[PDB]
Structure formats: C-alpha cells, structure tokens
Design a protein around this ligand. Structure first.
Ligand SMILES: Nc1nc2c(ncn2[C@@H]2O[C@@H]3COP(=O)(O)O[C@H]3[C@H]2O)c(=O)[nH]1
Ligand SMILES: Nc1nc2c(ncn2[C@@H]2O[C@@H]3COP(=O)(O)O[C@H]3[C@H]2O)c(=O)[nH]1
Ligand SMILES: Nc1nc2c(ncn2[C@@H]2O[C@@H]3COP(=O)(O)O[C@H]3[C@H]2O)c(=O)[nH]1
Ligand SMILES: Nc1nc2c(ncn2[C@@H]2O[C@@H]3COP(=O)(O)O[C@H]3[C@H]2O)c(=O)[nH]1
Ligand SMILES: [Ca+2]
Ligand SMILES: [Ca+2]
Lengths: 450, 450, 450, 450
C-alpha cells in the first residue's frame, strides 16, 4: 503493498497526476476552441492525451492501492481498499474522466477534442495535491500566491477560449466585436488568435474594457455576463491575494501594531525619551534577534506528546548543561520542558533581588548573568549558559535564616534568554523522583552556608 | 389554527411570497421603463400581477394567522394575532403594497405599470425568507453568494431601466449618450433595448465606462452619480463577496496559518527533519481525517441542554460499549458527556506511563491501544474501541502499592481518538450514584491484584 | 456661564459651526477655480462668507466659554478658559482661519476668493462634530457612510476644481485634454463648466479614464498624479465603506458563522435530522426574538457603577415581582444584578431534575415553567414570571432529607428567559443582610415539609 | 570600535545607505531604458554613481564594524565581526552589488548603464532601514503609507522604463502601440519620453487602459502580463493601504463599535433616555479625555522589568503624594505599581458605601472625591489627589466594631481617576516590609476612633 497517503510517495504521485490534470484543464478547452491548435499539433496532442490517460489509469490504480485509516490503522487489505475506492464518489469521477470518449474522433472527426472534456473530472487530484503542498511546503505563501495566479491564468485562458468560440459561432469578422476574420494574414495566425483572445479576456475579466463594444444581442449578453464574472471572480481571487499578503504580514503587522500602541501610550503620557529609547531598543532587539513570536502560542496547536519532542529537540542544547535535568533521573526533563516559560531580559535587568518572593527557578538558556553585590557594580559570580539560579528560595531547607527570600541579586549583563520555572511546578514535578532533589539541596546547603 | 413561524410551513410560505416580491422588484421597474415590455406582454403581465397580488393577500392572511411568542408560548388566539399584526409596521407596509393602484390603469392608461411600484413594499418578506434560508440551508455560503449575485443583478437591472427612462425623457437618439433611436430596426427591438441598457448599466456600475460620454448637463450629472453609485455599492457588494469567500476559507485558513507558524518555528529553530516530518504528518492527518475543528469551540454556542443531546447523539456509538455508562445507572452518561475532552494520539504515542500522575480517565472512541511492557515492544493487552483505561489511578483503593501511579503503560498503535475524563470530574460526577462505582473498583481490584 | 462640552448645547453649536466650515471647504475652492461662480453670485457669496465669518467668531467665543476638566471638574473660571484656549493650537488655527484676508479683495479684485482659503483651517470643528455625532447618534453606520460619501464628494469636487484651474492655466481649449473653450455656447455655461469638471474628476479618481488623453507634459504628469490619487485615496475611502458594511454585518455575520460551524459539525457527524431541526429552531429563535447578542460582552465596557444602573433599568420589570429583591432589603438587588447570568431554555428543557447538584438559583424573567412530576407529563405547579426556584438546594436547612439535591424537577413550557444566580454568589451576597434570608428559608421550610 | 546596531548611529547610517540604494533602484533602470537620460546627464550620473559606490563600500565597512549579540553581549572583536559578516549571505550580496561592472563602459559604451544593475543587490539595507524606521518613528502609519507610495511609484517607474525599452526594441513608432517616433519634436523630448511612459505605466498598472491597443503578438502578450501585474500587485499594495488605514482606525473603530453595541442594546431594551444620555456622556468623556485605551492591554507586551519603569515614570506624579509609597520603604511602590488597576468614575458615582465588602484600596490619581454623609449631600471630607482611601477595611484592627465594612461612603465630585489596589495584593505586598504598615494602621486607628 500500500501507499500510505501520509508518505512522500503519495505526494510525489499527487504531483505526477496533477500534471496531466492541469494539462487537461488548460489544453482541452484551448484545442476545442482554437481549431488550428488542435489540428497543427495533433501528432503532439495525441501523444500528450494518451500519456495523460495512462497517468489517469495509474492514478486509478494508486487509488486502489492507497490505504485508509480504520481504527487509526492503515488498511492494507487489497479488496478492502478496492471497496473503499469504489464506494467513494472519487471512483465515479475517475471512471467518468477515463471514459474512452476519444472514440468519437472517428465520428466527429479529429477537430473535436472537447470529447476529452470529461478528463477534467479528475480536478480533485489536482486540488488534493495543492492542499497537500500548502501543508507540506516550506514556502506556504509563495505556493498560495502561485496557486491563485494559476487560477487567474486558467480563468483568463478559459474566457479567451470562450470568446474565440463565440466569435467562431457568430462568425469571424461578421462584426467589429467578434475576433477578426481568420483569412487575414495577421489575424489568422494561431499565435495571434490565442494571444488576442487572451488580451480580450484579460481586458474583460479585469474590467478594463478597452475592446470593441458588442454589436449583437448575444454579444451584449455575453459581455455583460463576462464583465460580471470578471468583477466577482477577480475580486474573489485578487482579494484572496490581499488576504494572503495580509497573513504574510500577520506576524510583523501584529508586532508593529503592539509597538505603535506602546509608542502612542508613551507619547501621550510624555514618557521620558530615555525610557522611550529603552522601549524602542527592546522592540528592535525582539525583531532583529527574531524573538517577536512566542513559541507557546504557536506550539499550543501541536499535540502535547509532540510539542514535548519539539521542545526537547530545541532545548536539549541547554538542558544537558544544567545539573538537574538529563543527569540524575535522565527523564525528568520531559516533566517540566512543557512548562519552562522562556523569558528575555535586557542588559542590566535585575532578575532577582535580595528579600523578594522566591517563587521561580531560572535556567540560563543564553546570556551572561551576574550574582552581584547589592551595591550594584561589584560582580561576585558570573553565571553563563547552563547555569540555574533561583532554586534555593524554592525548597524547604534546614538552617535557612532567609526563608522564601533571594539569597543574592541576579542581574543580566546583556540580553539573557532564561527558562523561568515556577515554584509550584518544580514542587509538583520533583515529587515523582527525589533522586535529583538530594543533590539539588546539596547545592542548596552548600551555597546557603557560604 | 396557527402557523408557528419556526415550522417548515412558514418557511415554505416565505418562499412562496418571495417569488412575487422578487418578481415585482425585478419587473415593475422594467415594464415602467421599457414600454414595449409592458405593452407586448400585457396579457401575461396582467396575469402575473394579479397572481402576485393574490399571493400578497394570502401573505397578509398568513401574517394574521402566524403565532408569536409571549411568555415563550406560541400565541394561538386569533384576535390577539390580528392585533399583533395590525400593531406592527408590517401591516402598514402590507396595506400600502396591496393598495389597488391598478385602478389608475383606467386613468394613466395601460402604459404606466409603475403604479404597481407600491408592491415593492413587501420587500421585508423576501428579506425574511433570505435570513431564514441562510440560517436553515445546508449550503450557507452558496446561498449567500447567490443572494449577493441577485442583489448585483437587481441593481444592474434597475440602473439599466433608469438609463433607458432617462434616454426616453431626453429623447431616444437626441444625442450620442442616450439610448439610440427606437425607430432603428436593430435598436428598436425590446431585446436590444433591454440588453443594451443592461450593457450600459454594467459598464457604469462596474466602472468600466466603455460607453458614449455624456452630452447634456443632466447626462453628465447622472453619469457622475451613477459611476459613484457603481464605485460605492459595487465595492460594498463585491467586498461582501470577498468576506463571504474569506469565511468560506476561515477554517482552512486558520488551520493553514497554524501550520505555517509551526513550520516557521521549526525551520527557525532548525528542528530535525524527522520531527518536522512528524509534525507535517500530524497536520496532514488532522486535515485528511477532518479533525482540524474542535467540537468544543463550535458547540459552545449551543445550549448545554441541547449540546448535551448533540454529544449524546454523536458519542452513543462508544458510550454504549463502555462498561460504566448506559449500563449501571443508564443516565450517568449525560453528567460527563459535556466534559469528555476528545484527544487524538499519533501512532506510538505513550498515553500513559508507569509512575505518572493518574489524573485522567480515557475512553477509547476509535483506535487500537496497547497495554505494553516497559521494554517498549512487548504488547501485553490490546484495547480496542469501547475500552476504558486510566481509571484505577483515579480511585481510592485498598492494597494499592501504587497510589496515584499508572499500573501500566498505554501506547497507541495507530491514530487513537480517546475521551480524556479528568480525575476531578469523575470524582464529582460519581458522587451522585455509586451503584456504578462498586463494579468500577471491582474492575480496579481485579486488575490491581493481577 | 460655561458650555460644558458634554452637553447638548455644545453639540448643537458643533453643528452650527460645521455648517460654515463645510460651506467653506466646498465653495472657496469652487469660487476660486470657477470664476463665473464667484462673479455671477458674488452678492450671495459675500453674504454667505460674512455669515460664515460671524459664525467663526462666535465659535471662537464659544471656545473661550467652553469649560474643560481639571481634577475631573468643569472649569468655570473665565480667564482660566481664555488661557486654556489661547494655549492650545486650536486658538492659532482659529486666528489664522479668521484673519481678514478679504481685504485683499481691494488689491487682487473680487475675482480672487481663494484669499478665504484660510477659512478651511477650522476643519477641526467640523471633524469634532463628526466624531461627536458618530458617538451620540442612534444611526452610527448611516452617519459613517454619509460621512464617507461626503469625503468622496468633497474630494471629487476639489479635483474637478483643480482640473478646471489647470485648464485655465494651460488655456481653455488649447488642446484636447483641457476643459474646452469657454467661448463655446454649450461649454461656456457655469453649469456645464462645473458639471463636466466633476465628470472628469469622477472618471479620474474612480480610475475609469474615459476622458481625452493628455497632450502636454504638465497634463500627463497631473493625470498620472491624479490617477494615483484616485487609486490610493478612493481605495482608502471605498474600503472604509467596506469595513463599515462589515461592522454593519458584524453581529449577524458572527451569528451566522456560529450557525454554519454548528451545521458543518452536525452534517459531518451525521447528527439526526431531528436534532439538526432542533438546533436550527434554537438559532431561528435566537435571531427572530433578538437574543443573538449577550448583554454581558456588550455592557462589560460600561462602568460597573453605570452597567449596574443599566441592568436595574432593564430588569426592574421582574426583580420587583420576585419576593427577595426590592421587598426585604430594597437595596440587595444591586448586589446581585451584575451577576444574574441570563439563560434561555427551549420548550421542554429540564432546567432542574431531582437528585442533582443544586448550585444555581433561577429567577423567571419571562416564560412559563412547570414543577412537574418525574413521570414527565403531570404538571404539579406552574411558575410564571417573577417566580424564583432552585433556592432551597442552595441553603443550609434543618430537617432536609435531601441535602444539595433538587426537591423537584423544573421543565420549561415554551422558551423561558431565566436569571441563573449561582450558589456561591447568593451565599456571598446574602451575608450582608439576612433580613431577607429569614423569609427565604421560611419559604424553604414551607416547601420542604410539603 | 563597533557600531551597536541598536544605536542611533546605525540607524543614521541605514538612512545614508538607503539613499544610494533607492537612487540605484530608481535611476539605473531609467538610464538603461531612456538612453537620453543616460547620455544628456552622463557627467552627473557618473558623479552620483561613484558617490553611491563609495557609500556602498562604506556600508560594507560598517557591516565589518557592526557588532552582533552572542550570549546577549555585543561582539566587539574585529576579526569575529569580519567572520560574522563574510559568513552571511549579506556579504555575498554586497560583493555582488559592488563588482566593478562599470568597466564594461569601455566595452559596451557609455550608453549601457544597466551594467550597474547589480547595485540593486543592496536592497536589503534599504528594507532594513524601513523596518527600523517603522519601529522607531513616532509616525508609524505616515511612514508606512509613504513606504507603500514609494513602492507604487517605483513599480510604475519600472514599468514605464520597461514599456519604453519594449518600444525601443520593437522600434519607436513602428505601430500605434509602442512609444511614438523619437524624431518627432514633441515626442522626442526626454521629458515627454519619460512622462508619457509613466502615463502608459499608470494606465496599465492601475488597469484604466486608456492607451492604444497592442498591434503585435509581443505587444499583446506584454500588455496582458502587465495588466495582470497591475491587477495583482496594485491590489496587493493598495489593499495594504486599506489595512494600514484600518489599523489607523483600529482604536477609534473598536471604541465606536463598543459604543454602537451599547446603543443597540439600550435602544432595544428601551433604556431610559436619562441613562442613554449618561452612557453617551461616559463614552464622550472617555474619548475627549483620551481614556479609550487601557494601558494594561497595551503595556502587557512590554517586559515586566520595563513596564515597571514605564508605570513608575507615569505614576510618580501621584505615588509621591501618597503617604505609604516612596515615604516609608521608598521601594515598595514598585511591588504594587504593576497591579494598581486604574479606574475612572463619573461625577456622583459612589466608589464606597457603608456596610460593603472592603476588598479594594483606592489611590486618587486625579479628581475630587468626598467622604460624604449617608444622607447624600453633606460632604464631611474632601479628598483631593494623592489621598488614599478604602484601606481601613483591608487591615486587621483592634477595636473595629465594623469588620470588613466601609467606615464611610466615598462619592466622586466629577470624573475621578483612581488606582484600585485589591485587598489580596496589599496583603501580599506589605508582607515584605511592615515598616510602612505600622503608620498605615496608625492612620487606621486614628480614623477608626474618630
Ligand atoms: N547567595 C548566593 N547566590 C548564588 C550564588 N551563586 C549563584 N547564586 C544563585 O543566586 C540566586 C538568587 O535567588 P535565590 O536565593 O532563589 O537562589 C540564588 C542562587 O541560586 C552565590 O555565590 N551566592
Ligand atoms: N496494569 C495493567 N493495566 C491495565 C491492564 N489492562 C488495562 N489496563 C489499564 O492500563 C491503565 C494504565 O493507567 P492506570 O494505572 O491509571 O489504569 C490502567 C488500567 O486501566 C492490565 O492488564 N494491567
Ligand atoms: N419540591 C417542590 N419544589 C418546588 C415547588 N414549587 C416550586 N418549587 C421549586 O422547584 C425547585 C427545584 O430545585 P430546588 O430543590 O433547588 O428548589 C425547588 C423549589 O424552588 C413545589 O411545590 N415542590
Ligand atoms: N469613616 C471615615 N472614613 C474616612 C474619613 N476620611 C477618609 N476616609 C476613608 O473613607 C473610606 C471608606 O472605606 P473604608 O472604610 O475602607 O476606608 C475609609 C477611609 O479610608 C473620615 O473622616 N471618616
Ligand atoms: Ca476603463
Ligand atoms: Ca477599474
């Protein structure tokens, strides 16, 4: 065997089947409308159509060999897959899109390729590929815009073909509206035919209108309907363009809107230009160093038993340098990684101060912190990455003259990325295995006596 | 009896009255402006107008026979309904729209059907039908787009009629702007008249402008006003189109935006392509198997005493296979169905692990789980649908060497849809009837000894 | 005083000063550009300009006599108000807009009314009136759309005047782009002048372009700049139109989106058409009876000491029929009115059932409820409006064989609007005055014995 | 060293390098396409190009001398900065944009300035400056709109240059579509050349289309592609304009939407016009006095150890007049400034009333309050700014006949801005230092006895 739709093989086949479906959606109508296209390159159209039909058949086979999830397990029983396929509307659409209507080439002649129009009924495969690509691609907005542009181009191409067909029905050159006479040297070339039809279609759907006005009632009606199709469908698609660009700007726009609200508040309250500059510097840091997004709000949509792995694969850089995690229990790190709230501190920010509520443990992910003196400048100890502080005031200790108080003040030399671990959480998670707690308050007593 | 507006009969009548109202809104102005329309098909217009008026009268009768809610009860007293009708502005509008202005046909002649313009004053019924359909239809966006297209078409039709009337007032063919001379063979046909007027209207409201420029001051003024009506009203309607397409994409766009934020985080943090593929697979599963929507956020707008029934009608498939619910008390299932949080687990995800906080009971809705050994591969027990686990570590038990600990580790073979029932909730809800609890810890002791 | 800007007198004056400001913003540029406008109606323009200037002077006086809030109190000291006025930029703008530039009529002649262009510098007053109207009017969206239309019209009018001025500078009729020769009988009329200039302006700003193309470099540059002004500013304004219509649809669109999510869930889960019809009926009820909006989310932006008054003025209809409120303490009703959560129940919905957690007291605002038998049909007692139930299981009672249990089952005959009062809240709020509690458990014992 | 990108020097250099990048992005294509531009002002183009290249070199030097943050510290080691530069793609782009392609002037002649097209590869610097300006400027929306207008102008300019180049390739005047013959006196001027090309570009990108239709297939194709570029890219940019105006209106629109929901509720519930006027007055006050924004929601994105400084720099005006803060401990004010919830009370609003739950302490930021008698009018004490009340009923006091009760009723004479400090918070924060608490209940006893 089976294909496992989640796999890469299924996605690759989705591409390989979208190619014929897109080809069919673009070219069947073109060949049906522009007769010279069908006739001049008939030897190539036959090859391409037969290859497309072969790929359609192989796609039907793949649909027979693609497993589905019952009880969460991939069904691998062949006949079960055949039944699941045939019971779905997709099998009906596939049989309809693979009906050998090409036999009508013997009746209607080689000049009627619209018999292959049923081949469009595999559009679903194409759309599936798109909805898969949009999910799996690393450039979701580039692909989304390319998809919208493809839809625009297909719509304009189809409307060009429709215009040319209507000109044919009315008669080429019978009036100033229809496509001019084919017998003209310049206006008889297939290139000119298609490109002028596309020009007309673009002017009509984009509602520019710089085309000869209608002459007949059918022409007036078609032009009204087509200008309305233009207005509505092009507003739809080119406003989807707008929404895609909006969601492209979503993060940056939200960040900038927050900054603007802050600046409005500061200018209204006449906040000192010192503090205004400090705030602007904080936000410039958040942007430049790519910290505007908070991983919590993003990863909250992941499963906890997958967001856990995510956090591990991101923070194993530091949670191996820490003494508590991955050293004593070697598994405890998972119990708290999904609750280590990542904070960022500016240079000179006092994370801790003597005589404060010690309700948070900190793990230094990045940055240089200092166990300073209360004078403000004298740096007693420099804590680099992997260090952990703020854990002594969490625990119950014998001989602690300072209970629930910070034993020292910790300031940040530079921008520090820390993991604030709350006291309640450390309490709750160390209950399972105190084999790490013993050396934890080993460190605790050792630092509380000195 | 009375009609009970909530019923299907009332909605069917809403359709049956919207038909004449829509007919009147489309055709009265057309016949008033295009005199040949009124004259040539006068025998049909008379029949249709009289049928419309009869339906208007029957709609007034229905309004006299439609109950309203006082004290939440449907008023069935006839005279009370007559008073409620006559006291509402709707009765005034109905009498105004049913005034026999057709008598003016004897004074103004058969060439003045705008006397029936008062018939437009039942627009409310039409709109009511729409606002009912949008609520009750299964295709809300299809109907909404059809409604907007109907508004566009009606506006363009009315503007075409207005253009033709203005041409008539100025005189057909008196200058290049107005509709050409009626005496022309081609430009005198009612078909050509209406269709060219519609063409002009479309070019003006869509602001394409490929029409002969005005000549007189009245023409310049009307064209300015009409181009502005075009800009404003068509932006309104075709931007409502945009918002409707947006809300069509709302679920998919939110899902894809979450996926994009996740992928941005993973690529920025250089998350391993293993875990990136796992996350993409999780999201592909959520989409393909239609799990992107969380029933909680959707059904939270339902009444609890209706959302309860909803959850029952959805989850009675599994809550009959479970041993606790619908078996001992047979009514307890409602006390917890509105708090069974549905979770989804990937293949191989450890739902439970030995030596963890047993604070959640799980009911396997769909999927195969395994009571494995801690080695990781040896599957002791396979739990299929209807099974419940994680309930032993909830309860107070005699002789439990493992208190508040998982007696075994449960992993998911495939994608498991479970119902996580919190410990607090099971505690709170079993307090009412311990007739099920006794066999609950029957199972508890039986599994805790073996 | 003083005038007290919050008062109605200040708003009326805002209108009376917006009239000259709007007049000045519309007509000064018109008279400056269309010389015939200035000249032909000079006797009227002089009167209107002098009246506008008098009103400007009276507006300056009003600004001297309008109090401001210092320490939250309206300043009534005259000289303090004069200082507050003169210290503001508004005084500078007012003196600039009232500078007697009309004296230049003696130097530049009566054909130069753009000397009155400084009169536009009172635009602020106009805008203030708008921002006041939008706040105080009952039709905020009608006024907002009218304001946007006024901006559109003013912009188009100004661009028409600019086009005519540029034609004058280049010379009327010197090329096909500029306004045609004034000496023409038809193209020399002030009506034709202004209306064709407005036509050109509309075609340019709405970017239709059906105007003679530029000839000179200045004309090309102006047309480029004006088409870009068109694109940008008209997108701005006519997209503000879109956002205004969106916020017009905001409530209805949110309601309908909730209904659509519900229907999607129900159709996906194959919810029985019984329950689907019940849900659709619930939502039809919510809409038809105007219950889609929840007063909590709306009134949460009001002050509690004003939202309290709001809730009182709305619910004194029923909280006078209740026995506890406005009867014993006569003031207790305010302590709980801001926490009476309004619920709606469908016909047949069991609000209470025997043997359930009695943690909510209910006050029947509207609707008929029944104290039924557990059989389901036998109605023991019918509770109409003003009745209160679910209070016995809240209180501590002697001789209650049923503790924390519902003494009877309450069902809703029809759609009941109730006030669910939580047990914790009744406990917390009755602590202040048990003078009502005594008769509360009077009723309690009386019903608990029978 | 180093430059410290957060500093003002780096931003100034960002401007000084954006000037050549913008110059290059505007003029290289212009000179490449309009040959007369390159030739006539070659002496000036050479100077400007060499100055631009010198500034590019100095920008490369700056990039070598700009520190980056490792461990949150600004790297000042020269060679480390050289490595960080050369290891980034920016160094590749800078070397590519500074390659001396001007040497090709000796081969291709002075008429080929597109060899300087590589100079566009420093676009990043320009964009960086923009993203810095948008952050640091006080007019974020003005700058954003200016940036979008710059993008529009650059796109139109580039498309004008492209049109002129295509006309050159096809041949000037070979058909009606291309730019006319250069040999024409009027259509040969560089001014006319560029300005008509810009006119064509504006008509095409804004999709007005009032230009001669294409003649050749290449012209038709280019016009189709360019009209589509117009539609898509101009919708993008001029809808970004819409979103920028939306976020300009965001605060005012949210405020007005809240007011509209309130007014809809009041008119639907038939709220008395007294209370409707009171609510409208409250909202008029909120707007006029600039209180629609709540500093909590804005400043919650700031760091707590920066939002603290913000609140201090804003509220030190009053927290120096208070007796508790900045007087006894002199540091306690920071422990509670981030939890002082700012409330606003209308004139006559009873903040406190005798016999109520004293769970909030109030600090009068602005406004006159009264310790009144319960009669309602007799004002015992007038509390101005700096005063604090509601603190007696917070504390545990000996001899308090009124426990957890308000000792008096406090009403607001005028609009009072207060700081509501919750009881729990005062309890929690006074635990650290009771040196202020002693005089706190000094005041407490002193007022409780009298
Ligand atoms: N007092 C003290 N604290 C230190 C030293 N080195 C690291 N620390 C950390 O500084 C922290 C300050 O807050 P805590 O008292 O909670 O915990 C303290 C220790 O974790 C040291 O040498 N002396
Ligand atoms: N230990 C054990 N647990 C089982 C077995 N079969 C099912 N389970 C479930 O596995 C669950 C693991 O978590 P709990 O200990 O809370 O509850 C346990 C039982 O509900 C079994 O055979 N042995
Ligand atoms: N048992 C009983 N309850 C009644 C009667 N009339 C009204 N009620 C209300 O029905 C309510 C059901 O819930 P509670 O027991 O909390 O409170 C009960 C009473 O408030 C009655 O006649 N008998
Ligand atoms: N009773 C009384 N209260 C006063 C007086 N002056 C100020 N107050 C304040 O009024 C407040 C009312 O609420 P509290 O009793 O909590 O605290 C009271 C005091 O803080 C006074 O003279 N008498
Ligand atoms: Ca056009
Ligand atoms: Ca257009």
């Amino acid at each position: 065997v089976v294909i496992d739709p989640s796999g890469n093989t299924y996605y690759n086949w989705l591409f390989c089947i979208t190619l014929p479906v897109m080809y069919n959606w673009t070219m069947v109508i073109a060949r049906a409308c522009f007769d010279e296209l069908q006739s001049d390159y008939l030897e190539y159209w036959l090859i391409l159509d037969y290859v497309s039909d072969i790929v359609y058949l192989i796609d039907m086979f793949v649909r027979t060999r693609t497993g589905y999830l019952e009880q969460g397990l991939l069904v691998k029983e062949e006949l079960k897959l055949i039944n699941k396929y045939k019971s779905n509307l997709q099998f009906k659409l596939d049989v309809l899109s693979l009906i050998p209507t090409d036999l009508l080439y013997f009746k209607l002649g080689w000049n009627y390729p619209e018999i292959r129009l049923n081949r469009l009924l595999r559009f679903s495969r194409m759309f599936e590929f798109f909805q898969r690509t949009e999910t799996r691609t690393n450039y979701p907005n580039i692909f989304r815009i390319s998809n919208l542009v493809m839809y625009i181009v297909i719509i304009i191409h189809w409307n060009a073909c429709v215009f040319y067909s209507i000109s044919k029905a009315i008669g080429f050159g019978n009036d100033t509206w229809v496509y001019p006479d084919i017998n003209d040297p310049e206006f008889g070339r297939l290139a000119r035919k298609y490109v002028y039809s596309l020009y007309w279609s673009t002017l009509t759907l984009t509602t520019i209108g710089e085309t000869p006005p209608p002459v007949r009632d059918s022409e007036y009606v078609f032009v009204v309907v087509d200008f309305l199709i233009g207005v509505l469908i092009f507003a739809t698609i080119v406003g989807n363009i707008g929404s895609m660009i909006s969601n492209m700007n979503a993060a940056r726009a939200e960040f900038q809107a927050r900054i603007d609200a802050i600046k409005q508040y500061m200018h209204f309250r006449n906040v000192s230009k010192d503090m205004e500059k400090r705030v602007i510097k904080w936000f410039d840091y958040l942007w430049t160093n790519k910290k505007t997004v908070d991983e919590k709000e993003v990863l909250k949509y992941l499963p906890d038993k997958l967001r856990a792995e995510i956090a591990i694969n991101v923070h194993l850089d530091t949670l191996k340098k820490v003494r508590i995690f991955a050293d004593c229990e070697a598994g405890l790190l998972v119990e708290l990684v999904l609750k280590l709230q990542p904070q960022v501190y500016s240079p000179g920010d006092y994370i801790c101060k003597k005589g404060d509520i010690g309700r948070e443990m900190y793990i230094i992910k990045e940055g240089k912190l200092a166990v300073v003196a209360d004078d403000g400048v004298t740096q007693f100890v420099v804590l680099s990455d992997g260090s952990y502080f703020g854990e002594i005031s969490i625990l119950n200790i014998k001989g602690s003259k300072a209970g629930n108080r910070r034993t020292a003040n910790i300031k940040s030399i530079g921008y520090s990325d820390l993991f604030c671990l709350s006291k309640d959480d450390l309490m709750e998670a160390l209950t399972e295995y105190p084999d790490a707690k013993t050396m934890l308050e080993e460190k605790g007593k050792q630092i509380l006596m000195k």
